[model samples]
Target chain A: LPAHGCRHVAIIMAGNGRWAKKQGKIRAFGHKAGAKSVRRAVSFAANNGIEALTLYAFSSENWNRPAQEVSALMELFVWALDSEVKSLHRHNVRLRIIGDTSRFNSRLQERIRKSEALTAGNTGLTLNIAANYGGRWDIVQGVRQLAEKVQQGNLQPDQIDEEMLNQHVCMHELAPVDLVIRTGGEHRISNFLLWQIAYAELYFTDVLWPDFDEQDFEGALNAFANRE
Target chain B: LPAHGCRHVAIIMAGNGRWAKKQGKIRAFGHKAGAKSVRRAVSFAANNGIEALTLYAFSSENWNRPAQEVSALMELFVWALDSEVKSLHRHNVRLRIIGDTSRFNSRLQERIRKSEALTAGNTGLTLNIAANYGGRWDIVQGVRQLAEKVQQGNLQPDQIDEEMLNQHVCMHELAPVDLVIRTGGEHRISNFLLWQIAYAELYFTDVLWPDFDEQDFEGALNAFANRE
Candidate 1:
């Protein structure tokens, strides 16, 4: 891993549910296992001196899945937060979730808040977990916020520009994602981080999530580095 | 020239003042010539059955250009509307403008209203003119509008899906652009229809605007047709 070159790495961890289904287990089983992968990757990124890592954990469109599966995933979210916060903080990894948080359960919401607060001071790798997110949703939310300011006379409509609007985006404070690696061989971004991934180099692999390891991550980084 | 196919055409009318400079003319002279290109392309589209044509006539970032240039462009806009509305209507060519119009002069805004109204009934090949447009600006504006709707109780925060947001985009009503051709060989979209053009085939040529005749348009279209 390089010292100062690669700044940010974003991943769309695909095939979680498929991985669990292959073992004849519920999708929740895959999600639970996937969290461990996140933990491992965070450590790898921190050790590699990567400045930022964003994981597309859940998309807003995932809400359309079966009710039982959704609930199971939601439960796993809480479990991950409860179990992983200490380790994440110990590693000095900061946590930020970029997405619409209004739909999450109150308990999960509180846990998210506590996780963010607990890890906010960490100075190592900045971990941005995009849960229940969509790229378009991120943009629209920024727009609505600015529009409200305009309507309230706080911000003039004509005064809005790219920089102002960029700051209002969900992941505005973080560096724009440089590389978007998706597992499970999906070539398209599937509506993840639409605006931020505009110039991102995409890497796709057939490896399933449970099977993906540091080598897979390294391969993705190498592929991105080779892009001219 | 075939139905259901596109001949991607790149246009660079050049700056109004520069166009004027070549002929020892005024800024308005260049604008008048550019307006003719717009009309010419529209007529060409009607005759050629081209599926998509993107004209980078204005950009949101163009607000930073000289005020006189901006004013002349606005005046040319008015002239085009008043003179060409019936011609566009008779040709049955659908007219669409993609960009933020918040800063447009009120008179030009009214012209936009009237032009849209008059051509709303057209069913021919679509014509898109990018005005007050920048690609990044489009993405941000789309985000702001969607967010505002969510906050104002008009749209559910949870239901902000890609399709919904796509419909809310500046050029959502038109077909997704299949090809983007930029004349002057700039080799960039320069902030034109950033989101919608995610997968569009790109074509760039060095033929200057005044010299971009029917043959140049045909050549670009021919090249696009031969692409896989």
Candidate 2:
């Protein structure tokens, strides 16, 4: 990858539930497989000198899924955090969970906090997991912070600018996303990282996320590197 | 187009200058050719039952180009408004120029105001021309308006949510963008309608803006209709 190629990559890991259904298995089965792919992707990104990697694991819309499936997904998330945080810390990977975590049960929230704290001091690749997140929610939350400042007389409404808002959004410390890769053949953004990817090159692939491999990651990178 | 197909289409008219360079002509010539394509596209959208068409004509980044080029583009804009508003009125197309018009000269601002007023009550397709617009700018502007209300004690900082913010952004009254077509072989969004196109199906083509025809529009719509 050249200097102009991707420094930050965002992945919308879609199709886990669909992939499971295609196999006549439960959605949780596919989710567990997808977690393995996450490990592979994280190692690949870190070794490739990618500064940041943001993965879309869950969305606010995912809450509308059947209660049983949502419960299974939550359990998988907690298990993954407990199992992977040590590995992430050992590899010097910084983990950050972005989105509105307040909606999550207190137990899950505690797991998130612990996992994030364990990897907070890591100096290597920054990993962002977007759980229960939406792009519009990210923007509005940032705006609400500014509005709070204005209400307290610490700032004026006119003082707000793109740079200021940029400083306040999720992953502001990371480089702007250079490439957004969506797996599972979907062309829609599904309301993910709207402001950050304003100029990012988008790459869509038909491979289900549970089957995503190093070759697919390389393919996305090659596409990004060749972008105009 | 089916009911599930695109009702609102946004286009990033890219590669005019590159097309002109390819033709060994000035950029202005390509822009002029692009203007003709705009007319074709507008007519196609109206005839095809597309509810709204938003065109990216200029950006704040574009203002950084050479003074002569920027000046020429502005002149073309003024000329288009003066010459085409009546035709738009006759077709019952509602014309809107969206962006920060405060930086534009008073004369150009007046022309924009007049153009929007003339077609305000039209029942036909709505056409939006984004001039000096960036998606971040649009988001920040809407956030500022909300902050003003908070400062005046008319709203609470906690009251701002995605739906409320959506209402304040540009094109809130129209259907959310269903398809975003980018001409000239670029896969980048380029800061156009970031918030609005969060879930839009993107279509990229190698054809330059100057050469975008009805066939190209049809091809984009076809791709969008087949989306999952």
Candidate 3:
């Protein structure tokens, strides 16, 4: 496929809990299955010169999703980080964490900080994990920072613009996401990348998280690849 | 179809120029056809219990469009406003214009001001036409207003939040948009209502503006109706 200037690709790894329930299994089954797919997807992207790959773990919308199904995820995130940091570093993938780190416990936050610091310079397939993140939260945090500058007399009301706000938001270092793939039936965005993804092609599929494969990712790439 | 608590909808009347170009016809044919579909949508909404409808007529992303087409649209906007105001007012619909008005010619801006004032007291469906609007621009305007308060010592940096930003943006009077329909098959937003559409179900269709009929609008309504 032609590169077509395509680079960053974001994946909404959705429907894990539902996929578990659909299998007559607990949510752990789906989470465990999804972990395997994540590794697979990362491995595929690492060799593709895709520049960056972002994973939206359905964390923003999963808060209301069910209590029991959510437990394994909080722990799995830490487990994956501790175990995969060296491998991610080996693959030259820069691990960046974006979202509300406040809601996460101190220890898990500690792990995120450690891994991010460790791979801060690797620069291959920047793997962005969007956890506890919502699009509004991203923009609101940026606005809050800009307001502080205004109060300090370093900025003015007219000086606060989109480009200035973008500087304070997450993924300001990465190119605008070129393609957004949602691995679920839903066609709604639960406030993800509201600012950065203004022109990203949105691709929605009914494939469950545990079932989405490399081909599914490539399908999104093809659409984005051919986009003018 | 069940109402499912649907109270508001925002539409990005996209792809009119492209649709006309694809037909090997002039932009007027497409814009005129879009006008017909616009009437159909408004009439349908007026009859339904839908309280508010916002239409994005910005044509903000048409730099490469035909010169005659752009010129035609600039005049048509004023024409449409004057012609539609009386009928909209007769139906108890409040016609409000939202977006940057300073750039519009004084005459057109005056008409906007007049129509808005004339129907400000009406108590029926709210018909909002968004011109020269973009999602990033909307958020920037809100953040700018918030920054003004910070500069004036009326607000703290921490006080700037989503709710505060929302109050400063357009359509704060209306409910958050429930469904967003994009005509002409585009799967991306050109920065329209990104902040307010945090939970919006994006509905995309391939039907050209001129070809859009009652069924097209109803199809979108049906999707919103059945959504949880």
Candidate 4:
């Protein structure tokens, strides 16, 4: 990766259950396989000196899925946090779980806090996971915060602009998203980080997220690096 | 075009200056050639039964270009509005010139208003020409309006959400963008129609806007039609 290549890579981890269905397995099985891909993704970011890597682990839209499946995913997320946070901390990676964590069970929220606490100051990679998140939600939350400021008389409504909104949006500290990679062959944005990827070069791949490997990772990077 | 193909098409008319640079001519020449492509685009939409067609004629970012180039584009816009509006009226196309027109010369602003007024009752198709428009700018303006409401005690800050913002953004009257086609070889969105295109199937073409033809239009339509 050159200095001019994508420093901020946002990967949409989509289609775990569909991949499992294709393989004649349960949805839970697909999600478990998807975790392995997440490991590889984090490894790619840590080793490649990519400034920040964000993943759409779960979307606000995913809540419409079967209750059992959603519960299973929550359990898997808990397991991943407990098992992976140590290695991520040891490797100097900082983890930030974005989105409305209030929807999650208290125990899971505690685990999230513990993992984030363990890896809060790690300097290797900035990893963001979007759970129950939507791009529209991010923008709305930013607006809400600004409105609160206006109500407090700390800011004027007329003074609000892109720069003020930018400072309030998620991942405000990281560089703007240089490249957005959507796996599972979805061409649509599916409501991920809108403000952050305003000028991002998008890459779409047909490979199922569970099956995404180094070749696919290299492919996205190659496209980003070669993008005009 | 099938039923699943986009009813609303947002075309980012980009890269006329680049095409001129490629031809070893002044950037203005490329912009002139770009108008021919725009003509073809309008024909494609009108003949194809698209309910709404929005074209990004000039973006907010384009104002920072050379002064002569900006003046030339303004002149071109005025000419197009004056000459093209009659044809659009004849075809029952409702013409809308969106974005900040206050900074434009008063005569040009009058022409835009006159064009829109003449086509106000048209029912065949809605045509939106975006000049000096940026998605973020649109969002901010929406936010500003909402903040003004908060200031006036007309609305609560916490009540502002995606749905509320949705009603305030541009093109709220039409269905959300089904497809976004960008010409001139770039995969980047470049800050056009951000809130409106959260879920659009993005189509990018290497053909410059000046060279975009019926086949290219069909190619994009075919891609959108086949998208799952």
Candidate 5:
């Protein structure tokens, strides 16, 4: 924690399915375990005084997976929301999901809305969970909304700049990302928050998400602190 | 070229304005010098058999600069197109511009159309000049266009995936970006081709655009070759 000045940490947890396969279980089991890891990460951030923690929970592209697996993941999502909201509220952690929500089922959408509404006023660490998200999706949505505003004469076309566009992005209203983490030995960002990560330091690790503990998080934070 | 098979090279020639300021001349002079570098790069690629090259000529964010500079850039664009089209045609180099062209002036747009049309049949190294371009804009436009097709029943929603979305992006018909170079010591992409650069090897240099020559380009190529 002393090594990096990162007040915010964003992570794209990878290799859940692979971890499950290694454990000789279904991929859904790995996703469930991954949710527990998410809980641990949130608790760690809350305890560390980190200003924000963003997780790439679901990508828009992940919808291409088999229907059963997708359904299982959504169930896990709902379970996390229902089970974790109380703890998050107790810790005064605000929860926000950034992405296009139109494609989600109504029940899951309602759960997201309720969780967000319930935790909106908390002043502790902000937990940004990117569900059904893609970096490209964020950009396209920003453009579509801004263009519509311009078409409606609400915003002058000339007034749109990088800052304005950033403001309009799904999660930019919260805070600019400080550090981005990708686990499971992958080096690429995989279309996660493409616009906001312009200058954020990146940390990649080989440890699978199920095995990622507070020590791993601290290692990444330290690495980021050492970078110029 | 005996490196890890780098397929494409993209360059962001930043700091023209600052370079002009240092020279006690208008920024347009810096851009003109940068244009010369572009010509040199084209010749180098043509001679070297590098498959593709993308140049960040004008970014959507760059519209924030002074009106005079932008106008001069537009003029310089026309001049470069008028002067280089025949040479590029003779060399059989394919030319393209990728960005949100709706904001450009009609004359410039017409010239772009003409240049692309005139060079459409060429088969040499593909050259992409990104003007008023941004990674986010590319993604959103691609998504919007794909969504429109789905909405109009011309395409099925189920058929839309990363590849499909890539095909719809402005640069989709071109080559995938392989190497990303940022001049003037900048380490970030600064909203360049965000989606297309998922796994690209990045090269950063302190050499300003006016000072960048074939030797510098070769140095970057050598560095990219050494990247695993």
Candidate 6:
């Protein structure tokens, strides 16, 4: 089919732990399977005309989960970064890690820098991986930059407006998010991109992240197109 | 029934125009009827011990609507203020119109101030009517206040954190919103209370705003309680 009006799409890949438990496996098992779904989603989005794709792989709050689970997730994240960059570059995807990566281990941080550098020249789909990211944190970081300028007497306080703040937030250079999809039967944003998604259409699905496929992706697109 | 964990409950009263059009009446007719549903929701929340009820009556973008419809809405807003303040005071509801009222006509603006003053001392439910409000606009207003303080040497830019910004947003004294209900089939927030509702559980219903009743309100509460 043809492309929809959506330029940027974001997803909260949820329910991986639950999916794994139902299969009598650890949450890491489910997360590993969820990575496959991520590949599928990227392929679908790149094949379509979607300009940008953002995936919420970890949240600022996710650190509060069991120590073992968080460790497993971090390991999976590093492994994926090491394994997936070449494929992403081949697909002409520009990879950007969005979030406070300072919390990651030195090894993971170095890998993140390398992955982003390798794909910096890619011109196709812009893929953003949100790890340890909080929407409010993103906004506050932006505000701090503006305040720093004000502190230096270089900029006036009155210059801070929505447009100015927009320039400070993450993904300001990309098209505004047009649709947000949350897989697994959840009806909350979970503090993902609150500022950016102020006017974006929301789609919820009971399908677990690991089970999300092209058809599920199309269903969300169709729903977005149907909305007036 | 006792209240659940929700303290501040906000609603986006949508589909009034659609409901009226379906009934072969002007949009104002549906808005008129929607006011009754507002009354029902307020009573439900107050009686159930909910701390606050915020209604999105008009948005900043609503001004872009057809001139005739916008004029009719303004008239209805003033009429509701004139007719309902006393009843609100009698019921111990603290009426507050939360938005930039400077854009409203002098008559409407004066009426809003008077209404708020009359019910300022009430110890019951805090009823907030969002007129000419946008979530992004609300966030920006708070940002301007912070920027002003920075300019005055009262606050530093580096000191700007989520907690500090939270105090500057509207309804900072109230408990953070726990649930946001949208009447009408839309699944978007339409830029209502972005910072305040960062973790709010969203409940969307197909029932039109004019037709929202006691049962529908309870259903939303029940869904909220069911969320973990």
TM-scores for the candidates? 0.63, 0.97, 0.95, 0.97, 0.67, 0.97
Compared with the true structure, what per-residue lDDT tens digits does model 5 show for residues B80-183? 88889899999999889888787888888898899999989888888999999887677666655655554455665445556666687666775677788778
lDDT of 1 by residue, B1-228 (tens): 543376333343454455567789876676777677667766777788775566778766667777887787787777877888788788887777767676788988888877887787787766677788766867666666765664565765456656776776766765666665555433334545656755455555665565566776777666666643
The DockQ of each candidate is 0.13, 0.86, 0.78, 0.80, 0.16, 0.80
List the candidate 1 regions with Cα displacement exceeding 4 Å. A1-4, A22-26, B1-133, B140-168, B175-228
* Candidate numbers, best lDDT first, in rank order: 2, 6, 4, 3, 5, 1
The sequence of per-residue lDDT tens digits that candidate 3 reaches over residues A45-155 is: 886778888888745667775776666788889889889999999989999889998888798999999999999989678999999998888989998888888888888
Q: For candidate 6, write residues B67-164 as lDDT tens digits.
A: 98899899989998888889899989998888889999999999999999999999889999999998888888888888888889999888899999
TM-score for chain B of all predictions? 0.84, 0.97, 0.93, 0.96, 0.93, 0.97
Candidates sorted by DockQ, best first: 2, 4, 6, 3, 5, 1
Instruction: Name the 10 consecutive residues with the lowest summed lDDT in model 5 chain A.
Output: A149-158
lDDT of 6 by residue, A1-228 (tens): 235888899999998988999989998899999999999999999999898999999999999988998998999989998898899999999999999999999999999999999999998899999999999899999988988888889888788888899999999999999999999888999889989998999999999999999999999999999987
Which of the two candidates, 1 or 4, achieves a greater DockQ against the reference? 4
- Model 2, TM vs. native: 0.97
Q: What residue pairs clash in candidate 3, if any at all?
A: A135-A191, B135-B191
* Tens digits of lDDT, candidate 4, A78-130: 99988888899989999999998999999999999999988888877899999
lDDT of 5: 0.80
TM-score: which is higher, 3 or 4?
Answer: 4
Model 6 misplacement above 4 A: none
Q: How accurate is candidate 1 locally (lDDT)?
A: 0.72
Candidate 4 local lDDT, B93-167, one digit each (tens): 999987888878999999998999999999888999998888998999999999988888788889998999999
Model 2 CA deviation exceeding 4 Å by range: A1-4, B1-4
Regions of model 5 farther than 4 Å from truth: A1-3, B1-7, B11-51, B55-91, B95-121, B129-173, B176-187, B198-228
Q: Report lDDT (Cα) of residue B58, candidate 3.
A: 68
lDDT of each: 0.72, 0.91, 0.82, 0.88, 0.80, 0.91
